[PDB]
Amino acid sequence: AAAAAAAAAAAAAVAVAVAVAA
Amino acid sequence: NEVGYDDIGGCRKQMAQIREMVELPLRHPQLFKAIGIKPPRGVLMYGPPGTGKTLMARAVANETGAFFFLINGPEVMSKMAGESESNLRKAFEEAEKNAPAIIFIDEIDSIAPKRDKTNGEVERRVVSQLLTLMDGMKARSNVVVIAATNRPNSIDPALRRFGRFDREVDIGIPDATGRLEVLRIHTKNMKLADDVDLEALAAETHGYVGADIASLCSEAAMQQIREKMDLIDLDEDEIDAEVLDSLGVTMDNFRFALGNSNPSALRETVVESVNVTWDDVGGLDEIKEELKETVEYPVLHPDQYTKFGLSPSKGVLFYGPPGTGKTLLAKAVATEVSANFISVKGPELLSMWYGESESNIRDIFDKARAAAPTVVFLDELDSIAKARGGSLGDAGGASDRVVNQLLTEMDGMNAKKNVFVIGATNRPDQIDPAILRPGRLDQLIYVPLPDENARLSILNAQLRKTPLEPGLELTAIAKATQGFSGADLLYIVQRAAKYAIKDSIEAHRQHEAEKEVEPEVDPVPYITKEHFAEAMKTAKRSVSDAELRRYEAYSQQM
Amino acid sequence: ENNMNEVGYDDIGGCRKQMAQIREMVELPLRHPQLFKAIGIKPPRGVLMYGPPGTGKTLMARAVANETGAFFFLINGPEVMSKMAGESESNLRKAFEEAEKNAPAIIFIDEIDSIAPKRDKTNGEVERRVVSQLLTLMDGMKARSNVVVIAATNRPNSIDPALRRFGRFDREVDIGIPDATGRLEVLRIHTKNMKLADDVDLEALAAETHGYVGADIASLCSEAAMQQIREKMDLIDLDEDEIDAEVLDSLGVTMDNFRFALGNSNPSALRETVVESVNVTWDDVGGLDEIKEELKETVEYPVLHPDQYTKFGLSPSKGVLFYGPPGTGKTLLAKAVATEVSANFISVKGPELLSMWYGESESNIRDIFDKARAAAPTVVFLDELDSIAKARGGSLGDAGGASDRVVNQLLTEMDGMNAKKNVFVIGATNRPDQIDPAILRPGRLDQLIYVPLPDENARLSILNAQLRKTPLEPGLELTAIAKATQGFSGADLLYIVQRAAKYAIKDSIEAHRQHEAEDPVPYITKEHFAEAMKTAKRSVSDAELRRYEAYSQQMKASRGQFSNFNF
Amino acid sequence: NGPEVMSKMAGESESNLRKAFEEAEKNAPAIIFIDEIDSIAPKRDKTNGEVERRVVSQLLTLMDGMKARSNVVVIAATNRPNSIDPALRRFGRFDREVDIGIPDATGRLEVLRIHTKNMKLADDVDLEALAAETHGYVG
Ligand SMILES: [Mg+2]
Ligand SMILES: [Mg+2]
Ligand SMILES: [Mg+2]
Ligand SMILES: [Mg+2]
């Protein structure tokens, strides 16, 4: 018989940066 | 069991279309040959859940004596060496060999995902086999397939191409009249009291669709049954007879039902019921009348704009200094407007993942438009609409993309399915200029600092459920409290109540202390003049003068 | 005797309304079918149980299974799925057919969240097939035949919207935190079989319990019993052979065991964010009599005296903000409130709550305030509000206005679409001019208490509080110290005391050194203070003091247009 | 190898690690060499990917537990040692973090002598001058 399979690989996240107005 | 055309309600145009499509090529093939057109082979159905699509399919299966064969999307696959192909093949073989039958596949999205989106090998086989058999069932073989999908965007376009599935039928949601007949259909098999007037019931039922009306009816019946069971002492051992013929659902049951129910679409974002009424907001009367008129006129007097051929203004933005009942007005409309209401806090939508944020904005706006009419309350607009600038502190313009998506999905508003956007910001200067468009949040309401009579209204409306002295005049405080915001008056009254509580509990445990070694439980059953004087001796102002100056300048701009 | 342990409707308690709703829904269509044919409409045959963990959902289901005489079939969530392709749907089909055919039956779907997430957020295949098959089973042709489906969840928002429509799950019951009477009832049911001494007072225990739900109460009882066992297993030996019959009886878990277990345990929600119980008492905080009495007055009555508030029909005052020069003792007052007051305490630092990811600060704030209102009544201490409350728009260059979104989130969360039953925010800031204008508004933080530099009698009170445990010289008088210190703060007096202790310990260890070479000092002497106050300074300078007094007098000027105000 | 072990599929990276360890203990007393663990064992606190948490937990468990190891030794190599969870950097997992810095001019002499031990060359060239002018090179 042919079996099934579950799969969950990854995603994409977002970072936040700080700047200085010299 | 016994469901027919009488059972179906609303969607008369769609019902007539489906009736033609399913009867004419099956009861009159000779007429189709005579006119000279090959009758269609496939029809798909889509729309929000609970619109009676499956009910309609059962009615079509029953009314027409043609042989029927039910298949459900997720029920055609198997395990033994991919017998799913054999299952579908044998289904089609039985449908042809038995009679000029009719085949109905429900929830095709379960058995027809986009090729790229589904990963695996058995899915490819079943989808391709569905394609080839749907092609091979020729026109002269007198069978037709009916497709019923809850979500139309979950199917690859290859199944939608002309010649396999050409006729679409957007069932959608019913109108007020459609809701009226649905109520009549549902209530024609129960003992209804005389005082029921379904026209009003359809005037207030707004976001309910198809099945929710049945829920309302059944739950109302339950309310009547419980109201009449406790009074009669219906013992668990006994059976009552004389009560049976007297049970009748009253109007108050339906009022209870409408007050405690929610359209299934809005079930996710339901907020717990917090009582607010238009009499509690004493001040800002002109704003109250303007808001009620502008929000109710499209919902009760449509004909005026149709004769005028104009689109009444939709958006509005509240701005003003802190604590002047803006959120209170939002609560009041949410409670006593006779329309749906979805409030969202600014920061809830943002998230760390990529894309989900705007997807959530799409979800909320889709939900708002589906159960139209609705009133979207945007509190703290100073969180989403920020001056983009060249600051570059954004995460790749994530805020910028979110605001642009909100602009694109709120500016594509239609006169049909009216959704009223309520704005509320504390600092009006940091919102983008794009929000003042006539087609987007046009109205600009300013909530000013209250005056003497407004302040008196605030006090008397805020202490309605409050025991007071008989000989007390509130004009003096109004003359004294000049720049005092409503929240500050709340502070004053709460402090006075606190002093009253202090005196009450002091007298209480005092009297008890002499007791150990009924009368008046509270020797001070209401606040008193000296309590108010002591609460007012330590009162403060809420808003400084700089905020008043800057808001006055902002108002002076227009 | 499994019959004895079987839990009826009597066992479940504190949620009599939901109990009645479920009991009628399950029995009336199976006890008075003629009545339901007479009314005209059919009953609902789908219900969704939801609520926080440890409320009684599974217990409620067990009671229903024990009481109702119909067939009962149970389906755990993940149990259906199997590796081979297309068996889960087979499991659902066989379950449903056997349940329906074999007399009228009750389905219970435990942890539905494992099955129906959203139909569009998942990316697998088998799960979408299980949800579609479930939808078909709920509604279609011959959808159900005298069968009703119950589901239980802790996060109902992760459920497919199609499941929350009439015909699939008609009614949603909300089994939330029990009230004082509810917790009293659950305590009574859980203590009906153990042996109690007469001294026990369950009413008081329900009174001081503020957020415990169900299993929390059970845990309290169990641990108390264990403590009693560890109190009466100390007089008796191990006795591994067997236990004598004179000790097994007359155990009697007394009320102090309950008090001890309540003082140790915390609600099941708060244990994630439990803080150590720093030991402080009201006698430790010298001076500031009006501030301590005001705090006690505003915190203990709304939580203990709701009848009067209902009588007058006004909501209580919620917020409070301490502000003043550093070291006057605001954080000390917070410590006292945290340790002595019965209400729950959530200690959070100022910038502790920020986070690297985008929007996760706002999620963290939402989680903390939802947690606070979940186990209410609670008091939340926001130390150094000037870290979190910046004047909006002042920072052109920033991380995308993350501070602005944070402060706006706080503003809406402390005042929004919330019942606002019992949440007390305490503010403590050493730079009160930089706080956002809206935070100082009444209705959010209405009480601005200035803690000025202590007066001579207040410095004397502080000194008496700070030497309440140290052994002291009989002939030593603090009045000279008070008369001599004028501009000092409480921290400075603590510094003087610590210096005196330092000289005392130095002399003690030296004298012990000579003693061993071949307790001399019973207490601190006068000369230790004479030499310990020669290195004394003032912490806050005149500039900061003039700033704080200017702020206070600006508020007092804002207090204008007040007079005798005769009525 | 560093990144070879990790797999997108659920429960394969840890499966590979388990297979490697069991065969290594089965065959004979042996030495393992997990190079660039930093690509296998990042900070659990700062990571979001579930598979890295899974592999680091599996490594922690197998390296120390109930009768974890029996006459086996393991060696790790990283280019930076800070980006690893502390639980790995205690006794019983990685005892002593021995450093290996840039070679000295002497070390340049020995490495050149090793390199030239089999390559025929002119006699004029001198190794010490080459090492002195080869400053900054490594390995
Ligand atoms: Mg259907
Ligand atoms: Mg507001
Ligand atoms: Mg449970
Ligand atoms: Mg402090």
Side-chain angles (χ1 to χ4, degrees), chain A, chain B residues 4-5 9-118 120-379 381 383-391 393-410 412 414-440 444-558, chain C residues 8 13-567, chain D residues 1-119 121-133 135-139:
Chain A
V14 178
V16 174
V18 180
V20 184
Chain B
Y5 57 103
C11 68
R12 57 216 306 267
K13 304 175 286 191
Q14 290 80 16
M15 192 182 184
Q17 281 150 266
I18 299 313
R19 182 75 65 195
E20 181 275 354
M21 319 308 327
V22 306
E23 264 81 6
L24 293 202
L26 271 289
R27 70 179 55 266
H28 299 346
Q30 287 79 16
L31 184 149
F32 265 106
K33 281 185 292 301
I35 63 188
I37 298 298
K38 307 303 176 187
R41 298 293 86 193
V43 65
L44 73 163
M45 246 172 286
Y46 61 105
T51 50
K53 54 187 77 163
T54 303
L55 162 59
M56 157 163 32
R58 188 198 287 91
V60 167
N62 197 321
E63 285 164 336
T64 310
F67 180 77
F68 201 67
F69 197 77
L70 183 35
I71 45 166
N72 298 296
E75 183 55 15
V76 75
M77 312 190 243
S78 168
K79 76 194 188 183
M80 210 74 53
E83 211 67 4
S84 66
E85 314 321 329
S86 291
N87 289 141
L88 199 79
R89 282 180 209 285
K90 297 339 182 179
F92 269 55
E93 212 51 15
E94 191 78 348
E96 191 55 29
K97 177 257 189 193
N98 291 27
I102 295 298
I103 187 79
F104 167 68
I105 179 59
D106 195 1
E107 68 263 5
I108 296 85
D109 57 355
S110 68
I111 202 66
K114 293 176 74 175
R115 300 295 192 83
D116 50 8
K117 306 312 192 73
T118 169
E121 177 275 348
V122 71
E123 49 266 66
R124 300 290 186 281
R125 216 200 303 287
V126 282
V127 67
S128 98
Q129 188 252 335
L130 259 289
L131 273 155
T132 175
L133 286 55
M134 147 59 50
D135 295 310
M137 79 54 56
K138 180 19 50 183
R140 269 52 170 277
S141 48
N142 185 9
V143 304
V144 182
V145 57
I146 301 99
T149 186
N150 159 303
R151 187 170 65 253
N153 297 80
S154 161
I155 315 85
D156 50 357
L159 273 296
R160 292 185 63 174
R161 61 89 173 173
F162 308 125
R164 68 175 69 253
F165 285 111
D166 59 331
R167 306 299 145 88
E168 308 78 24
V169 77
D170 188 325
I171 301 173
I173 56 171
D175 202 76
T177 60
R179 288 192 297 274
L180 180 61
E181 311 67 47
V182 171
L183 320 153
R184 188 175 295 106
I185 290 160
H186 275 97
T187 194
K188 264 187 291 187
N189 293 30
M190 52 48 58
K191 198 266 178 168
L192 198 65
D194 58 355
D195 204 353
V196 192
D197 50 352
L198 278 68
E199 61 86 19
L201 272 186
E204 284 84 5
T205 176
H206 272 293
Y208 294 78
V209 56
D212 313 333
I213 298 303
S215 67
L216 205 62
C217 282
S218 188
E219 165 276 9
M222 290 312 184
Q223 178 54 293
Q224 184 64 232
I225 296 157
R226 83 187 63 113
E227 267 162 29
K228 290 264 183 314
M229 189 271 294
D230 201 355
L231 270 69
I232 63 178
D233 195 347
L234 187 66
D235 190 274
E236 78 299 346
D237 290 356
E238 75 198 22
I239 299 301
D240 195 306
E242 67 91 14
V243 179
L244 292 176
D245 38 6
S246 66
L247 60 93
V249 68
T250 62
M251 175 51 107
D252 58 6
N253 305 116
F254 279 38
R255 268 91 174 90
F256 164 85
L258 62 85
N260 281 15
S261 175
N262 188 3
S264 190
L266 268 284
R267 216 199 281 279
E268 172 52 279
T269 68
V270 66
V271 61
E272 164 288 337
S273 181
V274 293
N275 181 16
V276 174
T277 63
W278 292 101
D279 66 339
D280 79 1
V281 184
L284 62 104
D285 301 316
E286 299 90 336
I287 296 89
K288 295 170 75 90
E289 57 84 24
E290 201 281 338
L291 290 212
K292 72 186 298 179
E293 171 50 30
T294 199
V295 302
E296 182 52 72
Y297 155 77
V299 199
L300 189 77
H301 328 78
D303 50 310
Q304 283 77 346
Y305 74 78
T306 64
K307 299 294 289 181
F308 296 171
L310 188 137
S311 57
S313 167
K314 276 218 173 170
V316 63
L317 157 158
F318 298 132
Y319 67 95
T324 319
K326 301 180 211 91
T327 303
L328 193 54
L329 285 171
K331 290 253 182 86
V333 297
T335 58
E336 316 296 305
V337 75
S338 88
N340 286 297
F341 183 88
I342 215 63
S343 167
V344 82
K345 307 169 83 173
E348 320 147 10
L349 289 323
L350 280 70
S351 171
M352 62 78 70
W353 291 120
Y354 186 70
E356 78 301 23
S357 67
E358 47 276 60
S359 177
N360 296 328
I361 296 168
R362 271 94 167 280
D363 189 355
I364 86 168
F365 264 48
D366 157 83
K367 180 157 146 145
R369 301 286 289 290
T374 63
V375 177
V376 85
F377 173 46
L378 279 289
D379 44 8
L381 154 56
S383 64
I384 311 77
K386 298 287 93 174
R388 39 150 170 93
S391 198
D394 198 332
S399 77
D400 287 307
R401 79 179 200 269
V402 168
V403 62
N404 293 353
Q405 179 273 321
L406 165 152
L407 286 186
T408 57
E409 274 292 322
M410 150 292 292
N414 309 118
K416 180 249 283 181
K417 63 173 91 78
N418 48 5
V419 304
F420 310 73
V421 171
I422 273 296
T425 187
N426 179 316
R427 294 178 65 158
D429 47 324
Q430 294 86 12
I431 310 88
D432 300 321
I435 301 327
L436 67 90
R437 306 270 75 75
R440 295 179 269 178
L444 274 158
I445 297 306
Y446 169 56
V447 185
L449 189 67
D451 211 354
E452 294 277 317
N453 53 353
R455 280 195 290 291
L456 185 57
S457 56
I458 293 296
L459 278 297
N460 64 24
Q462 198 177 187
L463 61 93
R464 53 188 198 76
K465 299 181 81 186
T466 313
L468 269 294
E469 294 293 345
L472 175 55
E473 289 80 344
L474 275 53
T475 183
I477 50 158
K479 281 189 307 308
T481 51
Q482 187 274 339
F484 278 37
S485 167
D488 202 76
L489 278 297
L490 177 65
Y491 159 79
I492 293 166
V493 75
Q494 286 179 354
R495 178 153 273 188
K498 185 59 184 310
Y499 285 163
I501 293 162
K502 181 173 274 149
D503 187 70
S504 77
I505 189 64
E506 203 289 319
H508 191 300
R509 84 291 183 276
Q510 184 269 336
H511 174 277
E512 271 290 355
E514 286 88 6
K515 196 203 290 184
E516 295 98 12
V517 183
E518 291 291 328
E520 197 183 4
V521 65
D522 44 1
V524 57
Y526 37 75
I527 69 189
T528 186
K529 273 79 80 180
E530 66 277 24
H531 291 191
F532 198 103
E534 200 197 10
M536 184 304 284
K537 179 60 63 154
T538 61
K540 197 60 59 163
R541 189 178 306 290
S542 187
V543 161
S544 54
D545 272 330
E547 287 78 1
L548 191 149
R549 292 183 298 92
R550 67 181 290 199
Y551 282 63
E552 194 274 351
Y554 194 80
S555 69
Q556 177 53 241
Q557 300 317 276
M558 313 58 70
Chain C
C15 310
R16 290 289 203 290
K17 276 71 68 177
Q18 292 82 16
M19 181 60 210
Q21 275 199 58
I22 292 303
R23 189 172 66 245
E24 61 90 26
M25 271 183 188
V26 71
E27 69 89 19
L28 269 184
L30 265 74
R31 197 260 162 282
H32 294 131
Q34 68 283 30
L35 189 147
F36 276 119
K37 194 66 167 177
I39 186 60
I41 314 308
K42 310 318 189 185
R45 294 193 298 170
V47 61
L48 181 50
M49 213 93 69
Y50 73 96
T55 52
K57 301 181 282 291
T58 304
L59 167 65
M60 189 135 265
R62 204 148 48 221
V64 177
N66 271 319
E67 289 196 317
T68 67
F71 196 69
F72 188 92
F73 200 81
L74 173 156
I75 296 175
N76 292 317
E79 198 275 344
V80 314
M81 299 173 209
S82 164
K83 65 194 178 177
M84 165 46 41
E87 282 63 12
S88 52
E89 289 82 56
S90 176
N91 300 119
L92 279 288
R93 288 194 302 277
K94 60 167 79 61
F96 271 62
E97 63 87 19
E98 73 188 63
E100 67 88 30
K101 66 100 177 174
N102 182 9
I106 303 320
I107 310 301
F108 178 110
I109 306 305
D110 197 7
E111 269 323 321
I112 179 49
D113 304 341
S114 63
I115 295 330
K118 275 292 169 284
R119 179 65 62 108
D120 67 340
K121 304 293 183 182
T122 187
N123 308 88
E125 187 268 355
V126 170
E127 85 295 14
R128 278 201 296 279
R129 207 176 50 223
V130 168
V131 296
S132 47
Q133 181 61 336
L134 165 155
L135 284 174
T136 284
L137 283 158
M138 288 337 100
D139 199 336
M141 306 327 89
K142 53 177 181 77
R144 274 194 279 274
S145 70
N146 201 3
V147 70
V148 55
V149 289
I150 303 87
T153 184
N154 299 83
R155 52 182 294 248
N157 294 354
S158 178
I159 299 289
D160 184 3
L163 265 293
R164 284 190 295 190
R165 197 196 34 78
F166 170 79
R168 323 303 188 102
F169 282 138
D170 301 332
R171 290 291 302 107
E172 287 81 344
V173 300
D174 184 282
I175 325 166
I177 58 178
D179 204 77
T181 58
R183 56 171 59 104
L184 191 150
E185 197 275 351
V186 304
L187 188 62
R188 277 220 312 167
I189 172 60
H190 273 294
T191 196
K192 70 182 299 297
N193 199 354
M194 47 175 46
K195 305 190 283 293
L196 282 296
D198 56 58
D199 68 326
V200 305
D201 183 304
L202 299 173
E203 291 80 2
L205 271 296
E208 296 99 12
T209 44
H210 286 292
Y212 298 174
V213 57
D216 279 319
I217 300 298
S219 77
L220 185 138
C221 298
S222 192
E223 66 173 4
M226 272 322 329
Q227 176 57 232
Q228 182 61 74
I229 298 163
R230 181 254 178 280
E231 283 298 324
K232 216 171 172 178
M233 184 52 72
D234 163 72
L235 64 92
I236 200 76
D237 303 329
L238 185 61
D239 294 346
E240 68 282 5
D241 51 0
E242 212 64 38
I243 307 304
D244 293 331
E246 61 270 16
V247 298
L248 40 61
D249 57 354
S250 87
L251 291 169
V253 58
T254 196
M255 190 305 298
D256 60 40
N257 293 305
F258 284 163
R259 178 54 52 73
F260 164 80
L262 174 147
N264 288 271
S265 163
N266 265 202
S268 280
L270 311 194
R271 53 153 51 93
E272 179 272 336
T273 187
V274 71
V275 67
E276 193 278 337
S277 166
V278 298
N279 310 331
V280 179
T281 60
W282 282 118
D283 68 320
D284 187 75
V285 285
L288 317 177
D289 281 310
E290 69 282 357
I291 295 99
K292 60 183 82 206
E293 68 194 85
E294 195 171 332
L295 193 156
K296 203 146 73 190
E297 183 68 27
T298 191
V299 73
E300 170 264 327
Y301 290 139
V303 65
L304 287 188
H305 295 66
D307 48 331
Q308 288 82 22
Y309 270 107
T310 47
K311 276 173 70 58
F312 284 74
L314 280 73
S315 45
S317 188
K318 302 291 258 196
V320 69
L321 181 140
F322 307 133
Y323 72 100
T328 312
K330 60 211 86 175
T331 316
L332 191 61
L333 282 190
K335 290 183 88 185
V337 176
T339 193
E340 74 91 15
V341 174
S342 172
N344 306 127
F345 202 76
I346 296 296
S347 175
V348 66
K349 305 219 176 176
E352 153 179 59
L353 56 92
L354 283 70
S355 163
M356 185 45 170
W357 304 115
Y358 181 68
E360 281 325 316
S361 71
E362 314 307 353
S363 178
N364 161 15
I365 291 293
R366 277 189 302 282
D367 174 315
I368 199 73
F369 267 0
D370 166 279
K371 213 175 181 272
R373 62 185 50 91
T378 58
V379 65
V380 304
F381 178 44
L382 268 200
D383 191 330
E384 300 287 357
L385 272 201
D386 58 356
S387 65
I388 270 168
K390 295 295 179 182
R392 277 190 307 288
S395 66
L396 260 285
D398 43 351
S403 83
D404 290 336
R405 291 175 303 249
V406 158
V407 59
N408 281 351
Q409 180 67 102
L410 205 48
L411 282 159
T412 87
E413 279 154 316
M414 153 204 318
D415 262 357
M417 311 314 94
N418 313 88
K420 292 285 136 180
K421 53 203 180 167
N422 280 318
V423 62
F424 303 111
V425 306
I426 315 116
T429 290
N430 194 9
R431 189 63 51 72
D433 57 323
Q434 307 292 315
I435 301 284
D436 177 76
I439 300 298
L440 301 65
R441 187 192 89 192
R444 291 206 171 86
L445 293 80
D446 58 355
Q447 291 171 359
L448 286 65
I449 294 89
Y450 174 40
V451 288
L453 270 294
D455 194 75
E456 60 88 15
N457 299 300
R459 291 188 297 275
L460 187 62
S461 60
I462 294 170
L463 279 152
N464 291 284
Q466 289 173 351
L467 290 84
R468 65 182 180 148
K469 169 59 197 324
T470 185
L472 197 59
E473 175 171 12
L476 179 137
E477 296 78 2
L478 318 174
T479 58
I481 295 304
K483 273 188 295 307
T485 185
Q486 300 84 7
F488 279 43
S489 174
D492 314 326
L493 278 297
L494 168 68
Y495 157 84
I496 293 165
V497 172
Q498 291 183 343
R499 190 136 294 270
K502 186 260 276 187
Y503 283 84
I505 183 155
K506 177 190 84 66
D507 286 0
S508 84
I509 62 162
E510 172 266 358
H512 198 295
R513 176 257 295 186
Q514 291 86 19
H515 200 162
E516 298 299 331
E518 273 64 10
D519 177 87
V521 181
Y523 46 73
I524 306 99
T525 67
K526 294 197 177 263
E527 50 266 16
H528 293 92
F529 284 65
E531 74 194 348
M533 51 40 66
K534 295 286 181 176
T535 77
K537 313 193 172 72
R538 288 146 41 69
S539 301
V540 301
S541 52
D542 51 29
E544 303 295 314
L545 193 141
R546 281 182 299 100
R547 183 253 296 287
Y548 288 114
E549 63 87 8
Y551 184 79
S552 81
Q553 66 91 47
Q554 186 263 303
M555 321 334 299
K556 297 282 281 208
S558 188
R559 207 186 61 167
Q561 306 295 346
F562 292 167
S563 67
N564 58 353
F565 202 72
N566 64 341
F567 280 113
Chain D
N1 310 319
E4 73 89 21
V5 72
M6 63 183 331
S7 158
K8 307 312 302 180
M9 276 315 327
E12 311 312 299
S13 51
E14 308 75 21
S15 307
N16 303 341
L17 287 165
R18 292 185 184 90
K19 182 152 175 190
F21 262 76
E22 37 203 4
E23 63 83 19
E25 65 181 0
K26 144 213 72 187
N27 57 24
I31 187 175
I32 316 300
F33 176 51
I34 321 192
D35 55 22
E36 279 77 8
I37 67 84
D38 56 337
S39 79
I40 299 166
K43 286 277 191 311
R44 288 162 61 172
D45 297 330
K46 305 297 192 312
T47 193
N48 290 321
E50 289 46 50
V51 299
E52 56 269 47
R53 300 189 172 91
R54 201 82 48 50
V55 291
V56 66
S57 73
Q58 168 56 11
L59 196 153
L60 282 160
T61 47
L62 62 89
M63 181 38 49
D64 324 302
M66 287 64 77
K67 278 65 63 170
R69 294 197 284 169
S70 307
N71 192 359
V72 185
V73 167
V74 312
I75 310 326
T78 185
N79 48 9
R80 75 283 193 187
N82 297 59
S83 81
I84 300 97
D85 174 319
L88 280 75
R89 295 176 66 168
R90 69 157 176 78
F91 164 74
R93 304 208 176 87
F94 294 128
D95 316 328
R96 40 184 62 71
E97 312 182 4
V98 306
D99 197 323
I100 178 49
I102 290 146
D104 202 336
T106 48
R108 267 188 255 108
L109 278 171
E110 286 92 8
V111 66
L112 287 159
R113 283 164 57 82
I114 287 155
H115 284 169
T116 61
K117 186 49 54 183
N118 289 319
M119 47 87 59
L121 73 173
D123 57 354
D124 59 355
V125 285
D126 59 343
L127 289 86
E128 73 288 2
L130 268 283
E133 66 205 279
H135 58 101
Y137 285 61
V138 59

